């Protein structure tokens, strides 16, 4: 399994009720291990796993300072920005920025990104390169100058071919109970009468890890089923994750349309056809 | 572990 | 942690005078050598985050992040060069110095 | 330096004399700040980090106390001096953020505390 440490970042301006709200989080693929929220009485960042506990605590001091200084530049920029747009001081604004690496099978280092975004649009973005400023509009140019003329891609680099992929392998190994697991689909089927003349099945996955699944339907052909009912996979909260794909079908050819599951913890494909 | 590199202000 | 020797290390004029600086922290992120005159305070020569060599007039350094080391080297010393020599690790936004290696380049 | 002062530059108090030195910084704005101390050696022992105004961060516990009353105006005091204060006083500023982490040092302070 390729792997991946993504850290993400929201920095709220609320003017006249003080300093602007700040959310850090950390994920190690879809386990996410730290958190830090400026409107906690922490002012740590702190443990969101197990695995991350065992750190100590010139760790916690220096992810706290580091979070900290992220947090500083998110003040100075929701300012600097506001500026550059030409808005007013009342009225609140998001500054959001991503960033993480990619690993595959090898654990060797398959790509890195760093984007920032304002008011939930593309602002700055990093190319593949690791090297080159994609800018939104003439005032990302503004920022695209200054960073260009300062190495900050130089400096990122440094980071995501570097630290990260460093500590997202000795986080691939701390956590190995957690990480590397590859809980399976638990899968059942549901029928429900539309009509007289159609009926919709339901294919269930539920208590799986990781996130990634294909829920697909066929039947007398290869070829799925072109249109279907799928949900966004979402959160069981216990780690987990839960996902269906249903479809329609016609009363006489209930138990004749089948459904395929795919997940790094099926050995193979599974398949299942309706029973009462 | 963040990065403590190329965190620069806008 | 990062350690360098103390002085004084006597290099004659003209010679390279190889100074080095180790640290254990794997959270360590970049890498400074400063210099210091006598009564005065630390200037910046170099800095470096990538493994490989950096060369700015006589000064060259030398980082490697597997082995733990960053090296300044300096090329043809001038008694003028004759200072302390203070190693910084920025470990988690925090710059830590070593104690510095002091340096008599000998006329 | 010009993008950094620092003031007093030499001082010889006795033990138990209030302290206080300043550093001003001009040409950049929304700086980190740091007091810096060499003693006992070469070697900068990190006294106080400032991310920002009015924030300020003890590294070490101490009878030493800071305070950033301005983006640009740090302020390192002491109460009552004990002989262990003794030392090199240095105010550095850093670029907002964690960029490269290059320190800019101010022309330091020289504290001897005597008995």
């Known amino acids: 399994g390729s792997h991946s440490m993504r850290y993400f970042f929201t920095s709220v301006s609320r003017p006249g009720r003080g300093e602007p709200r700040f959310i850090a989080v950390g994920y190690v693929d879809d386990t996410q291990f730290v958190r830090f929220d400026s409107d906690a009485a922490s002012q740590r960042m702190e443990p969101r796993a197990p695995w991350i506990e065992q750190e100590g605590p010139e760790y916690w001091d220096g992810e706290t300072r580091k979070v900290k200084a992220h947090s500083q530049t998110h003040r100075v920029d929701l300012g600097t920005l506001r500026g550059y747009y030409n808005q007013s001081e009342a009225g609140s604004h998001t500054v959001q920025r991503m960033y993480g690496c990619d690993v595959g099978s090898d654990w060797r280092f398959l790509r890195g990104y760093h984007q920032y975004a304002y008011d939930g649009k593309d602002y700055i973005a990093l190319k593949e390169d690791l090297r080159s400023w994609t800018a939104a509009d003439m005032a990302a140019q503004t920022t695209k100058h200054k960073w260009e003329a300062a190495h900050v891609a130089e400096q990122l680099r440094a980071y995501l071919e570097g630290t990260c992929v460093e500590w997202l392998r000795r986080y691939l190994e701390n956590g190995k109970e957690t990480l590397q697991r590859t809980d399976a689909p638990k899968t059942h089927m549901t029928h429900h009468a539309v009509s007289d003349h159609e009926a919709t099945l339901r294919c269930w996955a539920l208590s799986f890890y990781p996130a990634e699944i294909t829920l697909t339907w066929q039947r007398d052909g290869e070829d799925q089923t072109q249109d279907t009912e799928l949900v966004e996979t979402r959160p069981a909260g216990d780690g987990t994750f839960q996902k269906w794909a249903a479809v329609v079908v016609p009363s006489g050819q209930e138990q004749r349309y089948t459904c395929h599951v795919q997940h790094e913890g099926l050995p193979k494909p599974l398949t299942l056809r309706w029973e009462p | 572990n963040l990065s403590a590199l190329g965190i620069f202000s806008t | 942690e990062v350690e360098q020797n103390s002085g004084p290390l006597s290099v004659p004029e003209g010679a390279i005078a190889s100074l080095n600086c180790t640290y254990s922290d794997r959270g360590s992120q970049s890498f400074f050598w400063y210099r210091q005159y006598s009564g005065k305070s630390p200037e910046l020569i170099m800095f470096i985050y990538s493994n490989g060599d950096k060369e700015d007039g006589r000064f060259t350094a030398q980082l490697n992040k597997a082995s733990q080391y960053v090296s300044l080297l300096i090329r043809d010393s001038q008694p003028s060069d004759s200072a302390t020599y203070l190693c910084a690790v920025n470990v988690a936004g925090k710059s830590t110095f070593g104690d510095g290696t002091t340096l008599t380049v000998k006329p | 330096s010009q993008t950094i002062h620092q003031w007093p530059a030499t001082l010889v108090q006795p033990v138990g004399s209030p302290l206080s030195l300043e550093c001003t910084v001009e040409?950049?704005?929304?700086?980190?700040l740091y007091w810096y101390r060499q003693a006992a050696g070469r070697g900068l022992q990190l006294l106080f980090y400032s991310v920002g105004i009015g924030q300020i961060s003890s590294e070490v516990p101490q009878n030493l106390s800071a305070s950033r009353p301005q983006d640009r105006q740090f302020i390192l005091s002491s109460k009552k001096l004990l002989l262990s204060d003794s030392g090199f006083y240095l105010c550095?500023?850093?670029?907002?953020?964690?960029?490269?982490?290059?320190?800019?040092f101010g022309e330091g302070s020289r504290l001897t505390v005597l008995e």
């Open positions: 040409g950049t704005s929304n700086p980190n």
């Open positions: 550095a500023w850093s670029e907002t953020g964690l960029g490269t982490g290059e320190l800019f």
